[PDB]
């Protein structure tokens, strides 16, 4: 029922939301056309986790994924986004998993 | 040097430029492990450019 086992080193059982089937499905078909996938969710731990879940639902290889953060809508921002990017942070992700 | 600051060029320049574009595109695609479909398509395009 919980979807997590406190007695087995916190192994969990995530599963797509009963109302996001379409959303997740469209990314899977669209993923082949895209060369390099850019996860641009919020920099906080919740956003970081959404990025982590996307990466594990779309599959592929780590190198095919990149993490970018958009400052503002201004071109002086959407540009710098792909300029000095990075990848997802595990510590941040695990912090959110701990809270959840 | 054409009049008005423009230029007249041989088609060879166009062919070489297309080949360079395809080659650099292929390498930048390859170095990040893209799905096989697009890499094969771009390899085919590169072969076409060479021909």
């Amino acid at each position: 029922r919980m979807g997590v086992d406190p007695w087995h080193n916190w192994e969990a059982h995530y599963e797509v939301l009963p109302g996001k089937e379409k959303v997740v499905s469209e990314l899977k078909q669209l993923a082949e056309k895209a060369d390099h996938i850019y996860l641009a969710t919020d920099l906080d731990r919740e956003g970081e986790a959404i990025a982590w879940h996307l990466r594990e639902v779309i599959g592929g290889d780590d190198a095919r994924y990149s993490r970018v953060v958009f400052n503002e809508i201004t071109k002086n921002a959407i540009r710098q986004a792909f300029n000095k990017p990075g990848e997802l942070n595990i510590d941040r992700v695990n912090a959110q998993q701990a809270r959840r | 040097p054409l009049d008005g600051g423009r230029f007249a060029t041989s088609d060879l320049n166009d062919l070489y430029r297309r080949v360079i574009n395809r080659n650099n595109r292929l390498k930048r695609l390859l170095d990040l492990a893209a799905p096989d479909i697009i890499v094969r398509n771009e390899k085919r395009m590169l072969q076409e450019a060479v021909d």
Binding site: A34, D35, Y38, A40, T41 | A34
Partner: peptide, 18 residues
């Protein structure tokens, strides 16, 4: 090839794609 970008809010996406 084409790059795939993913954000949280749809409204923000439409704005980024622009």
């Amino acid at each position: 090839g084409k790059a795939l970008v993913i954000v949280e809010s749809p409204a923000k996406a439409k704005t980024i794609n622009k």
